[PDB]
Design a protein around this ligand. Structure first.
Ligand SMILES: CO[C@H](O)CCc1ccc(O)cc1
Ligand SMILES: CO[C@H](O)CCc1ccc(O)cc1
Lengths: 115, 115
């Protein structure tokens, strides 16, 4: 509360560490469905169904331009990518499996890096 | 943003300074309408009309028990006292004038102490 602070966790390296993690995401062989925005003009249903589209290039732009106020907002956007993927794609599809693989991949790097 | 911090204003004395200011509020001769909660069982209209009743003793209790997360939440409750007073009392009444005097009194101590 007022004049009562929790010990401040060191966050000075978060920007660099999230960038590193995103780089490993981008270079994963199953990253291809998530590198660019889904094309809203060509994919039926997607614009109406997926209220908040997200992808790695958009996350990269936001990270590079100071649009994540903290660790958690970055993680929320990464998870949003995979939540969207689950909403729109069957689990037993190439893209569906990609999403599951990438989410697993992310959450490990996230745990290892910050926990 | 992430790993980009504004210079941190020193807030370690805020709890003590707000306590000092509240003490001067409490000891002001026109503080008497605001020292204790308005009696909701005896004052017609007050419970229905005034959605968030506030008074100095309640503010004192909240301050002493770590219920203000920061400077501003404390100031919001003090102002709430006088906003309520304006809502319920005519300007040309003893209590009405008291409220105006106390608000002026507070805002000066607030400006002088933290600005
Ligand atoms: C993250 O990528 C997408 O969700 C792809 C959605 C999609 C599925 C099948 C198609 O033929 C076209 C687009
Ligand atoms: C902050 O004190 C109050 O607003 C008092 C409201 C009130 C006005 C006249 C009365 O006869 C009783 C209560």
């Amino acid at each position: 509360s007022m004049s009562v602070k929790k010990p401040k966790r060191d966050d000075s390296k978060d920007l660099a560490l999230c960038s590193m993690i995103l780089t490993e995401m981008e270079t994963h062989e199953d990253a291809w469905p998530f590198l660019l925005p889904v094309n809203l003009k060509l994919v039926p249903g997607y614009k109406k169904v997926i209220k908040k589209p997200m992808d790695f290039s958009t996350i990269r732009e936001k990270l590079s331009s100071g649009q994540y106020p903290n660790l958690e907002t970055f993680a929320l956007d990464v998870r949003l990518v995979f939540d969207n993927c689950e909403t729109f794609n069957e689990d037993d599809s190439d893209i569906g499996r990609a999403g599951h693989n990438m989410r697993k991949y992310f959450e490990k790097k996230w745990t290892d890096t910050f926990k």
